[PDB]
Design a binder for this molecule. Structure first.
Ligand SMILES: *[C@@H]1O[C@H](CO)[C@@H](O[C@@H]2O[C@H](CO)[C@@H](O[C@@H]3O[C@H](CO[C@H]4O[C@H](CO[C@H]5O[C@H](CO)[C@@H](O)[C@H](O)[C@@H]5O)[C@@H](O)[C@H](O[C@H]5O[C@H](CO)[C@@H](O)[C@H](O)[C@@H]5O)[C@@H]4O)[C@@H](O)[C@H](O[C@H]4O[C@H](CO)[C@@H](O)[C@H](O)[C@@H]4O)[C@@H]3O)[C@H](O)[C@H]2NC(C)=O)[C@H](O)[C@H]1NC(C)=O
Ligand SMILES: *[C@@H]1O[C@H](CO)[C@@H](O[C@@H]2O[C@H](CO)[C@@H](O[C@@H]3O[C@H](CO)[C@@H](O)[C@H](O)[C@@H]3O)[C@H](O)[C@H]2NC(C)=O)[C@H](O)[C@H]1NC(C)=O
Ligand SMILES: *[C@@H]1O[C@H](CO)[C@@H](O[C@@H]2O[C@H](CO)[C@@H](O)[C@H](O)[C@H]2NC(C)=O)[C@H](O)[C@H]1NC(C)=O
Ligand SMILES: *[C@@H]1O[C@H](CO)[C@@H](O)[C@H](O)[C@H]1NC(C)=O
Ligand SMILES: *[C@@H]1O[C@H](CO)[C@@H](O)[C@H](O)[C@H]1NC(C)=O
Ligand SMILES: *[C@@H]1O[C@H](CO)[C@@H](O)[C@H](O)[C@H]1NC(C)=O
Ligand SMILES: *[C@@H]1O[C@H](CO)[C@@H](O)[C@H](O)[C@H]1NC(C)=O
Ligand SMILES: *[C@@H]1O[C@H](CO)[C@@H](O)[C@H](O)[C@H]1NC(C)=O
Lengths: 40, 97, 242, 213, 48, 126, 126
């Protein structure tokens, strides 16, 4: 196998530093069942 | 009793993969470099002196460096950065003599 | 909602050691304990101990407090909620009363008063402790017999005679013929050797439309035998149909 | 074992059956938890009840538990043919481990009778060149699991080389067994025929092969 | 929030055993270059 | 103990219910390229008030925890009390009920405080 | 029945009081020309919090419906109970009381929860 230097797309240069990061959104609203009822 | 009832919880550790608008941060010593705003750091938010990193125990999340949007956002930032820095600069239109 | 697979059955002489593995899949290996329970024909079911892959904490029974070592490998992530792992256990100072089946079990819950409780179990690994050496089996073909003349049914099989130690798995046509297969338990002879029998019920009209090959496997001796059961019977009550 | 259960208990189809599980105060039952397991011989056990009265995930509501201050109980309503097996209980806590009981063999009554299917095999040609001779008496599909096997050499009792296995439960909720007779190549060619008598509930079945033909 | 993978061996794709969360990523210098990556973050143990 | 923001993410729901006041605290947090953060922090409060509006129109308003008079339908992944809070994470749980999340929300805003509060107006006049 | 957003607009006040949780739900809803919507959606949450602030400083906080300890002045269009909720729409009603709307608002924020809550501080110390 033969390997040669490349590049061109500068987006690759950022991937070498952003490989350990990703964006997520927090959705704090979660419903769950339990034996608890409110008042009347 | 034995029959369950729903209960609303606010502040649960629940997240999903998405894309948003990220902002910048670049220390406080970098702003002291001045020289009429070098590169980008002009109205950039000063970096938190004591950053916090919370290790999420028992958590296994899948990453994808090739399908990460932070790159496509950063790339469009540096490009736009290049244009804004050349707008108030001297145009060499009559140098094609 | 996963699967626990252990190593094959081994034969060990008393005084020596043996290491039984237990590979898991289909769930997070570190989120549940790994219990080890054995069962002999003299002391009944006995709980040996458990170990938490997350922390590494162990709790052995006083009976196995000074001759049993439990070890677990690191978790290998597959998905965000499932993974693959492997748990081991090492019992030293083997004796004659240590002969039986050893099981590994997954814990029930993560938190509560019954976290370590054995819920999901493996298939078990048979352990035989004897001074006797390993002896290969002798497979003999069983001639087809008449089961029902008016029904047009028959029954053929193979004979596994004189083997040691247990167990022995018998399949047909590389696992193609499974229906009507009845495998009987072995017998403990006076010599100390075992011998079982396998028989599959098949119609009499099937002769040159299906090949009957019984697959007897004996891993302890590392030998496999493929016998071609002759479809031509000798039963006079079946010869009428032919 | 220090944990004592009932030796044997029975129950009819469509009915219920209670299994006892007691012992000293050191194992039962104050400040102790009780669990139950369906453990078929030779197979893998299945968790039924955990924490006294709570059912395991995927367990039919036909099972129910109850613990007193001196003993615990397990009621199996609407009995099934596949419920006839051995059931063990376990005394445990959050810290300590498991202490299994003596065991309980549950017999389901009210089941239909099943005539045994017996097939006797003569010694193969490959064994006659060894040379040996082994008669194979296979027993299957009989209920309950309790049969006796006697051998005869030309209508004459055999007391040498007679061995019979223990009745084992199959997958179709029935029992099976196997008997073998060790003979010499001379006796196989000196006797007109050999038989395999199987007795069950007074009724005795018999299959006979003949070397003469 | 921004999640950060903290395992020493990670090819950028797949599940991560040791995950941590942060508000701001580390100082990433936008060095524009080709063929040779300059002034970047060094890998752990074996080269990746 | 304080694991921090999103600390008990891998912990059980019962355990993570102790860390509710932590993820709630850091949820709001107090020329171009500067408009990058403006449009982002505007969406930040819109995202906050959106959940707060739902949290208000339901029988809650008071954040963190609150009960409701809605029977748990077995079709919504029939699990037991000890099998949810002591054997499942919030991430793992939200993955199953995600199909019925929009359904449950409707039974909280409409069926409850619209019928409950109107019921109270009849009880408070006497 | 669900007539939808602004459904019972032509219906009586008593009937339209059943559709309160509907107009409240769709009230917040989750280079130039793109700044057109930004400045608009910013005013959207300011308009929301404005009403929410009034709804909070009064003896309400809890949305939809709430009672108050203010006697209805006859000068504010003296109508009867059955002549308001069963013979008048909210649009038609708001047209008459529009003159006294600012007056009533003052009797709710000042006269009540400033004197009521302070009263409670005296009742809660004992
Ligand atoms: C990430 O995931 C992991 C895995 O999923 C998870 O770990 C589980 O955490 C839960 C709690 O949330 C654990 O469940 C509890 O376990 C308690 C531990 O049991 C005690 O007893 C052990 C046995 O002691 C015997 O043996 C020793 C010899 O070894 C002997 O000397 C003793 O005398 C005794 O005979 C003991 O070893 C163990 O000690 C460990 O823990 C202490 C801290 O407590 C630590 O200092 C030690 O170094 C050692 O690591 C421990 O003392 C158990 O007590 C507990 O039961 C009580 O609590 C529940 C409530 O949870 C009550 O309802 C109940 O009534 C009891 O009061 C409970 O069972 C579980 O065991 C973990 N492991 C698993 C599931 O594999 C992490 O928490 C997760 N973390 C995050 C951040 O997500
Ligand atoms: C080029 O690579 C070299 C590595 O050979 C870089 O030198 C290293 O720089 C790092 C900081 O980026 C130093 O780490 C520091 O270590 C001290 C030790 O206590 C710690 O207290 C600091 O917090 C920090 O982590 C590292 O020591 C240093 N290496 C040596 C041998 O001194 C160099 O900075 C790189 N140049 C660039 C990126 O322009
Ligand atoms: C990155 O590493 C992961 C290991 O975590 C690789 O995933 C495995 O890939 C092999 C083949 O390359 C498969 O046989 C395994 O089943 C994969 N494991 C899992 C959990 O998916 C992944 O392929 C690697 N990526 C690249 C581009 O090499
Ligand atoms: C669910 O848990 C409760 C504990 O209160 C128990 O009584 C019940 O039998 C359990 N049901 C099932 C189906 O596990
Ligand atoms: C519960 O879900 C089922 C769907 O499986 C549905 O038919 C039923 O109406 C639901 N229960 C109620 C009370 O709506
Ligand atoms: C949710 O629904 C989708 C299809 O609508 C289905 O594929 C998925 O399995 C469902 N979730 C669960 C937990 O069953
Ligand atoms: C009611 O309105 C009249 C004006 O017609 C005013 O004089 C009177 O003071 C008002 N009542 C109260 C209690 O303020
Ligand atoms: C409100 O006041 C204006 C003048 O201030 C008056 O013209 C109008 O009639 C009043 N509204 C009603 C319903 O009377």
């Amino acid at each position: 196998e033969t390997f040669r230097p490349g590049g061109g797309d500068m987006r690759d240069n950022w991937r070498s530093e952003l490989y350990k990061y990703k964006v997520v959104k927090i959705e704090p609203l979660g419903v769950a069942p339990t034996r608890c009822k409110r008042r009347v | 009793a034995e029959n369950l009832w729903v209960t609303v919880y606010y502040g649960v550790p629940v997240w999903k993969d998405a894309e948003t608008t990220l902002f910048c941060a670049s220390d406080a010593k970098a702003y002291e470099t001045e020289k009429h705003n070098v590169w980008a750091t002009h109205a950039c938010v000063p970096t938190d002196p004591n950053p916090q990193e919370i290790h999420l125990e028992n958590v296994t999340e899948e990453f994808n460096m090739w399908k990460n949007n932070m790159v496509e956002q950063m790339h469009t930032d540096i490009i736009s950065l290049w244009d804004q820095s050349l707008k108030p600069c001297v145009k060499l239109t009559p140098l094609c003599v | 909602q996963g699967q626990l697979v252990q190593s094959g059955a081994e034969l060990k002489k008393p005084g020596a050691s043996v290491k039984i593995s237990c590979k898991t899949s289909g769930y997070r290996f570190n989120f549940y304990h790994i219990n080890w329970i054995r069962q002999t024909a003299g002391r009944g079911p006995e709980w040996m101990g458990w170990i938490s892959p997350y922390s590494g904490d162990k709790n052995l029974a006083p009976a196995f407090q000074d001759r049993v070592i439990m070890t677990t490998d690191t978790e290998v992530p597959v998905t965000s909620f499932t993974s693959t792992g492997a748990a081991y256990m090492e019992i030293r100072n083997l004796k004659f009363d240590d002969t039986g089946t050893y099981f590994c079990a997954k814990g029930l819950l993560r938190d509560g008063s019954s976290t370590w409780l054995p819920y999901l179990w493996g298939q078990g690994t048979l352990l035989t402790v004897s001074s006797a050496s390993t002896k290969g089996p002798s497979v003999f073909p069983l001639a087809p017999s008449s089961k029902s003349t008016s029904g047009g049914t028959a029954a053929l099989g193979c004979l596994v005679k004189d083997y040691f130690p247990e167990p022995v798995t018998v399949s047909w046509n590389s696992g193609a013929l499974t229906s009507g297969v009845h495998t009987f338990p072995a017998v403990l002879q006076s010599s100390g050797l075992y011998s079982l029998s396998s028989v599959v019920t098949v119609p009499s009209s099937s002769l040159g439309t299906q090949t009957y090959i019984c697959n007897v496997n004996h891993k302890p001796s590392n030998t496999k035998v493929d016998k071609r059961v002759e479809p031509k019977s000798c039963d006079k009550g079946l010869e009428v149909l032919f | 074992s220090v944990l004592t259960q009932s030796a044997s208990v029975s129950g009819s189809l469509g009915q219920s059956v209670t299994i006892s599980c007691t012992g000293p105060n050191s194992v039962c039952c104050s400040h102790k938890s009780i669990s139950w397991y369906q453990w078929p011989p030779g197979r893998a056990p299945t968790l039924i009840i955990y924490e006294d009265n709570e059912r395991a995930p995927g367990i039919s509501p036909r099972f129910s538990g109850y613990k007193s201050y001196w003993s615990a109980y397990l009621t199996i309503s609407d009995l099934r043919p596949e419920d006839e097996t051995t059931y063990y209980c376990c005394s445990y806590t959050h810290n300590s481990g498991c202490v299994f009981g003596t065991g309980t063999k549950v017999s389901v009554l009210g089941q239909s009778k099943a005539n045994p299917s017996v097939t006797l095999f003569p010694p193969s040609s490959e064994e006659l060149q060894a040379n040996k001779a082994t008669l194979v008496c296979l027993i299957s599909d009989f209920y309950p699991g309790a049969v006796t096997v006697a051998w005869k050499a030309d209508s004459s009792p055999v007391k040498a080389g007679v061995e019979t296995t223990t009745p084992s439960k199959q997958s179709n909720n029935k029992y099976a067994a196997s008997s073998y007779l060790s003979l010499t190549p001379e006796q196989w060619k000196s006797h007109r025929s050999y038989s395999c008598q199987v007795t069950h509930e007074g009724s005795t079945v018999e299959k006979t092969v003949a070397p003469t033909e | 929030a921004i999640l950060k993978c903290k395992d020493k061996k990670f090819n950028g794709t797949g599940p991560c055993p040791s995950v941590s969360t942060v508000q701001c990523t580390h100082g990433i210098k936008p060095v524009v270059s080709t063929q040779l990556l300059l002034n970047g973050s060094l890998a752990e143990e074996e080269v990746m | 103990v304080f694991l921090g923001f999103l600390g008990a993410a891998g912990s059980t729901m019962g355990a993570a219910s102790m860390t509710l006041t932590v993820q709630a605290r850091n949820l709001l947090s107090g020329t171009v390229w500067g408009i990058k953060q403006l449009q982002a922090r505007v969406l930040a409060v819109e995202r906050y008030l959106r959940d707060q509006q739902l949290l208000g129109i339901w029988g809650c308003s008071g954040k963190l925890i609150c009960c409701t008079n809605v029977p748990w339908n077995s079709s919504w992944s029939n699990r037991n009390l000890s099998e949810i809070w002591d054997n499942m994470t919030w991430l793992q749980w939200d993955k199953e009920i995600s199909n019925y999340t929009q359904i449950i929300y409707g039974l909280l805003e409409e069926s409850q405080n619209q019928q409950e509060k109107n019921e109270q107006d009849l009880l408070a006049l006497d």
